[model samples]
Target: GSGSPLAQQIKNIHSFIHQAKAAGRMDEVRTLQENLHQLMHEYFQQSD
Candidate 1:
């Protein structure tokens, strides 16, 4: 399903964020956060 794919992608993104945070890479984390936000926006739109 469409949502499942999006959910997986979000999981991957979240993993990226977590790794960056763990490594103390604030820049990467911030960038990932922006991307995460964009994905979430798209997810919301698609869900609706």
Candidate 2:
């Protein structure tokens, strides 16, 4: 449902991150945030 195969995993993690942040327990996703950005980096870096 996103732009690319590389983007799909990012979308999944983003949704999961959204759900996790809804817990009122917001400090736990920094690692995932890092990964999200990394994946985004690759998305653009490797795109045709």
Highest lDDT: give the candidate number. 1
Backbone Cα, N, C clashes tallied per candidate: 0, 0
- The global C-alpha lDDT for each of the candidates, from Candidate 1 onward, is 0.87, 0.80
Error of 2 at 7 (Å): 1.0
Q: Model 1: how far is 26 from its true place, Å?
A: 0.3
Error of 1 at 22 (Å): 0.6
Model 2, position 7, has a per-residue lDDT of 84
Clashing pairs in 2: none
Q: Please provide, for model 2 over 1-48, each residue's C-alpha lDDT reduced to its tens digit, 9 standing for 90 to 100.
A: 255787889998898788888885467577778888999888888845
Off by over 4 Å in 1: 1-3
TM-score of every candidate: 0.83, 0.75
* Per-residue lDDT of model 1, residues 3-31, tens digit only: 57886798899999999899999999999
Assess candidate 2 and give its TM-score to the true structure.
0.75
| Alpha carbon deviation, residue 31, candidate 2 (Å) | 1.3
